[model samples]
Target: KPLIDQLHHEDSWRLFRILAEFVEGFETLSELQVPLVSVFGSARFGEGHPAYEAGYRLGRALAEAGFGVVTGGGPGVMEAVNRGAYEAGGVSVGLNIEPNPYQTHALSLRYFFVRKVLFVRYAVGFVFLPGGFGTLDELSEVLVLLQTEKVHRFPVFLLDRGYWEGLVRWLAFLRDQKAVGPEDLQLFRLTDEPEEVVQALKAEAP
Candidate 1:
């Protein structure tokens, strides 16, 4: 029974292996009463980078605001965010392979593409830090998801205006051509303040 207990669903506790807990995955999420917020950023931004620092505060504020931070669960900004949440003594869940410090609950999902749905499905909001095309994949995907009404609208926040501005500038052209709805652009808001991020998400709390 103790052995089975190790495989049991635990809320607000230690990490679990995907292979061992795969069958109980849905059950695990069902037990999560805390509001979770997904954060994405460049994996290359290691410790000490400006964006990394932002990610750290990003998680810290979310944790302090009583929201569980969720990330891709690798390194770089992901690690930074997890570190902050961990330091704040909050639940930080990572849904990816390998590990990094401060992820209270780590799930090793080798097939992360299939796991991508969770970020959209689970979280009340998304905090986008400085990232690359891969991160853009999420910004774009989330846009489509909400635009298509496939998923309920969740607040999307782009941290740091400068890094993300150029893309939005071009999006203006799409809007000009009526290719992008004016309401679609309103789906996401931009800000650098952690306070804003926290307050906005908490409003959508479950």
Candidate 2:
């Protein structure tokens, strides 16, 4: 059938695109060292938010503790992490996904699938700050990958109680509703203090 043939051809192109993404990701991230921490947050939190301050402190603390810090390699919180880690004399890694400018020092990729795999493979921990859609996407991606056990278990910490409390409560509701397992809901560590956050991550790191 002509229609069936066209569908198969489209599928084949899609498969090749995914394959290229994976190949690029594997090649780029294979050289990074261990004890890396991936920091996620809003790109809009520039100068004033508590999240910026907290992210800076966390970056410094993680670096001081001999952990390499990784970020999305843009401005806002990503800049804070890189600035802190660089000042702390620790290794800072940035993987820049597509359509984001200012990620001059990152591995720019077209598909997020590749980037997500590298994030899991290279980082021992994830420090999530209050962000919008992309941040949630990163969090969800990490959680799903973790649930499937396709990757190793790593500590995921949410920074700032004031910002994340509502979401936490919602997850608690899901726990009560029995729509999600207790283990799935229990996968994250939440806190406001940077030092304590780092300690929790360090303790959970394999």
Candidate 3:
């Protein structure tokens, strides 16, 4: 009965709490270094996966290149990134449930909306590693937001063509079929180099 009661209230109204959540996030991230790039990847790929290596290198490069690496504080590729950035002595901050041992500033948020808002609010770019549906959804969300001008056009880099090639093909088909403009296909970039990700962000950075 208590569970249902909580659900009833949760289902009905929760707008003001969202606004409050925003305040907490803003204050927490306000002092973080600028030009942070959001990194996305599978929360399932452990240290043994190649994606882990790729993710670690990217984070380290991003940090070494003077860019703050921001990612979800979880296991798998997220952990890989946080580990690398932290080891590099970079601003390796976590935006959600920051319990990962690698984060420099472990910030937690109960509301994803607030977390995502912070992701875009301070992000200079976005990097995607080999991942599952969560990665795809995040990519699409950022793409659609960029496509519609809902957010500023930030550099979106997908690492490892060997992993993301099929999705690109399907996206190309989407463009060819008129679901997306030919130019829309350029919204995200596919690259095989970790340092290239850093360079692109530097170019895109103000």
Candidate 4:
């Protein structure tokens, strides 16, 4: 019991780990100035997937249109998108975190909270692709913040209509049932084209 108590007392030192994450992120990105659009998708999508290709195209197109791109910085869709932005001569940033024990990316991170702040702080909008739990986590976080008026609203787009329509319908039902208000549902628009996604973000951001 004494040894365990001594070890647990050191837990207070853990705050420094989070602080270091914030310090590193803010130092690297504080001077960032370009309009940024975050591209989110499943890290599991491989090199040959069509959604992977779409993610890449969106990043490249967004960059060529003079906006920077932000991604989770791992492989799969994140890498694909960043690959596009980098190839197109645009600023490509990756906000990485370390919750997934098995996932790897070009840019890996260990702290998500700091990274999440940077993602929202620097970006003008979000371009979401089909993903599992992590994707939903990011998407829903944004939606809730917008619904609560916590952050100035930004555009959100789903790249795959067929894959996303069911979720959208459910959201509508939630709104209809007063589970989520109408204004909350109005915070995002859906699209399947890279050009339209970029256009909507540019048009919608404050």
Candidate 5:
């Protein structure tokens, strides 16, 4: 049937387009060439900030343990993470977005969905450093994905327990108010030590 033939031909092109996007994504990921740990944090934490130092140390620890670092590709916490990873001879990947032109060496993707996919797909786990709304957004997305089983069980670490305690307390309030399930509290780990994060990650690895 000529109509069937045309349909098959058109479907083939559609399939090819999907394949092309996947191929490009895989290739871009391969270029990073390392097991990744996606780290999110505020761009406001400069080099002088304690959270910045924590990010630097966390990056180095992750690198020393043979994991590469991935960040938002901007200054502040992201810069510290990338700097540590770079200094330690580990792969440093920055997923750049608009409004943050600080990271000169970053992968610029056309789609946020694709970029987020790369961030999730390649990462062994995620690290949350001190940050504001953007950081919270990333953390919440990962948590929701994990909670809903959209992704495999991955370790989520929150560094600087002191800074995050207020949020945790608010989450507790939500739990008390019956706004969230109790088990949701078990989704992430909070810590002040970078070594603990590395150890936990190592334990979680297959």
Candidate 6:
């Protein structure tokens, strides 16, 4: 009975809070002058990990190409990217649940959905390194949004093709099973080359 009662007024009125979050994010992030790209990867991959090194290079390359970098603002790969962008003297943005330790223009949001919206809206492209479930979840969200035409089809690149090959195979199996359309497999590019990723982003940029 309490649950049903809450649905009558409490739940319905929560729409305002959601809208407020969107408004604040949009207004705050829209001020950035440079083109933005989001980089996603596991926070668990320590500094010496290949993924971390790749993320650092990817962020620095993107920054050198005049694109601002955005990340989750946590430790590990996120920090690597943020650090590279910052040290490169480029605009580094971190949309996170908490403040990033790096020297970045970090925005802390109250909700995950709000942060995700900013990531998608502000970035011209996305890069995914070898990460855990959080990274995969973000990748799936962007792919679905693109596949459904909810967002403009932007370039999505997966670094370290070797690490992602098994998942690609699984996706292929899904394609065979008719669980996902064939074109869905084309939603992202897989590469080991950071230069290729930057070149692709430049090609796709309007």
lDDT of each: 0.80, 0.77, 0.84, 0.76, 0.80, 0.85
lDDT of 5 by residue, 1-206 (tens): 44234445557874564455556756767676567889999899989999999989888888898888889888899988888777777777788753333332467554455567777887788999999998898898888888888887788999998999999999899889988788998899899998889888988886
Total backbone clashes of candidate 4, pairs 3 or more residues apart or in separate chains: 1
| Backbone atom clashes (below 3 Å) for every candidate | 0, 0, 0, 1, 0, 0
Better of 1 and 3 by TM-score: 3
Clashes of 2: 0
> What residue pairs are clashing in model 2?
none
Residue pairs whose backbone atoms clash in candidate 6: none
Tell me the spans in candidate 6 whose CA falls farther than 4 Å from its real position.
1-17
Question: 19, model 2: CA deviation in Å?
Answer: 4.4
- Writing each residue's lDDT as its tens digit, candidate 3 over 1-206 gives 44223434455445555676688777767787656889989999998899999999988988888888889888999999998999998989887742579988877666665777787776789999999987897888888888998877788899999999999999999988999987998988899898888887887766
Model 6, span 55-103: residue lDDT tens? 8898888888888988988889999888888888888888876344664
Candidate 4 matches the true fold with a TM-score of 0.86
After superposition on all CA atoms, how large is the RMSD of candidate 3?
Answer: 2.8
Scanning candidate 4 in windows of ten residues, the lowest lDDT window is: 99-108
The residue-by-residue lDDT of candidate 2 on 1-206, one tens digit each, is 44234445457876676687777767766665647788888888876777778777888898888888778877788777776777788777777766233222367665666677777887788889888888999998898888878788888888888888888899889889987787897788888888997888777765
How many Å off is the CA of 109 in candidate 3?
A: 1.8
Name the regions of candidate 2 deviating beyond 4 angstroms: 1-21, 99-105
lDDT of 4 by residue, 1-206 (tens): 44234434468665666677777776666565778787789989977998889988998888888888888887788888888888888878877666222211233456566667767766688888988888898889888877887776677778888888889999999988999876887788877898899877777655
Model 1 lDDT per residue over 1-206, tens place = 34335544563232434434454445555467688788888889999899999999989888888888888887899899998988998889887743787888876664344457767777688889999976898789988998999888789999998888998888888999999888788989888787788887777664
For each candidate in turn, the TM-score is: 0.85, 0.84, 0.90, 0.86, 0.82, 0.89
lDDT of 3 at 62: 84
